[PDB]
Amino acid sequence: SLPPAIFLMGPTAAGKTDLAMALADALPCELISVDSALIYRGMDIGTAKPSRELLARYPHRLIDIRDPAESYSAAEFRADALAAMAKATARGRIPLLVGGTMLYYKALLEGLPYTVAQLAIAPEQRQVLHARIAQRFRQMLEQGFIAEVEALHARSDLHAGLPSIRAVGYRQVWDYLDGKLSYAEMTERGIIATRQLAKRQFTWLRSWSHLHWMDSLAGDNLPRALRYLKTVSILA
């Protein structure tokens, strides 16, 4: 028999982290982040990383595990995720992998000794997701996104071409700091970059099988999610 596992994916800004925390309060879960950007320390505001307080009450594996000067491959994610899942399983906890880095999920499924239930969340209308993406980005700037990048920009061991700086929006803020862009251009292009990411994620998701879709605007996703576990033959 194979131990249970949950995958919670979807495009950026869909509210995945929100639902993960809810599920974490209904079942004994072990939150595991599947995000090539959240792995970096010092990149919290621009990455929409859960606050230090929220992480305290909802611990996430694979968050803040690398310095921005370091690289992280899908191969390393695979090994770390398998380790975290086995560790949670041994404790009777249900591995709950939440995030939108499809390349990571792919490496795990292909290159799994688990009976996986796969959940996905997003708005029915992409226009709803787009508006939130623009608003969320503008708020990041208000909460100190620029100051956050200034600290990275000041490091001689970091440059704009690094893997870490590929996290959406960071390069635009970096260029702004280089005096190459106006505040307006930095904002518009960071939003475009993020909208572009969602587009790439949707492409991956539309071709993915065994996905139980949920609506970001729905108010009862918890009960709906808890109900699906049985469909995939998982008794929890």
Binding residues for ATP: 10-17
Question: Is residue 172 part of the contact set for Mg ion (CB under 5 A)?
Answer: no
- The span of 31-39, 85-93, 190-198, 207-215 binding Cl ion (CB under 5 A) equals 31-39
In the bound state with Mg ion, the residue whose beta carbon lies nearer, of 17 and 216, is 17
In the list Mg ion, Cl ion, none, the entry touching 148 (Cβ below 5 to 8 angstroms by class) is none
The residue range among 27-35, 67-75, 134-142, 225-233 that interacts with Cl ion, by the rule CB under 5 A, is 27-35
The minimum distance between CB 38 and Cl ion, in angstroms, equals 5
Instruction: Pick one of Mg ion, Cl ion, none as the site partner of residue 35 (Cβ within 5 to 8 A by kind).
Output: Cl ion
With CB under 5 to 8 Å by kind, the binding choice for 17 among Cl ion, Mg ion, none is Mg ion
Q: Which is nearer to Mg ion, 97 or 158 (CB)?
A: 97
Least distance in Å: CB of 6 to Mg ion?
A: 15
- 8 A C-beta contact, residue 77 and residue 28: no
DSSP string, 209-223: SS-EEEETT-S-HHH
208-219: burial string, b at 16+ Cβ within 10 Å, e else: eeeebebbbeee
- What residue numbers does the annotated binding site cover? 10-17
Question: DSSP code of 93?
Answer: P
Sole binder of Cl ion in the list 24, 34, 35, 170 (CB under 5 A): 35
Residues 95-114 that bind Cl ion (CB under 5 A): none
Residue 44's binding partner out of Cl ion, Mg ion, none, with CB under 5 to 8 Å set by partner kind: none
Encoded one letter per residue, x for contact with Mg ion by CB under 5 A and - for no contact, window 5-34 reads ------------x-----------------
Cα distance between residue 201 and residue 151, in whole Å:
29
Strands (DSSP E) found in the chain: 4-9, 29-33, 60-61, 94-98, 115-122, 212-215
Give yes or no for a contact between 181 and 175, defined as CB atoms under 8 angstroms apart: yes
Contact segment (CB under 5 A) with Cl ion among 35-43, 83-91, 102-110, 164-172 equals 35-43
Helix 183-206 with 126-142: angle, nearest 10 deg: 140
- Last residue before each gap in the chain (C to N over 2.5 A): 111
- For 7, which DSSP code? E
Nearest to 94 by CA among 231, 208, 229, 233: 229
Token couple for 82: 């398998």
17 vs 172 by CB, closer to Mg ion: 17
Residues that bind Cl ion (CB under 5 A): 35
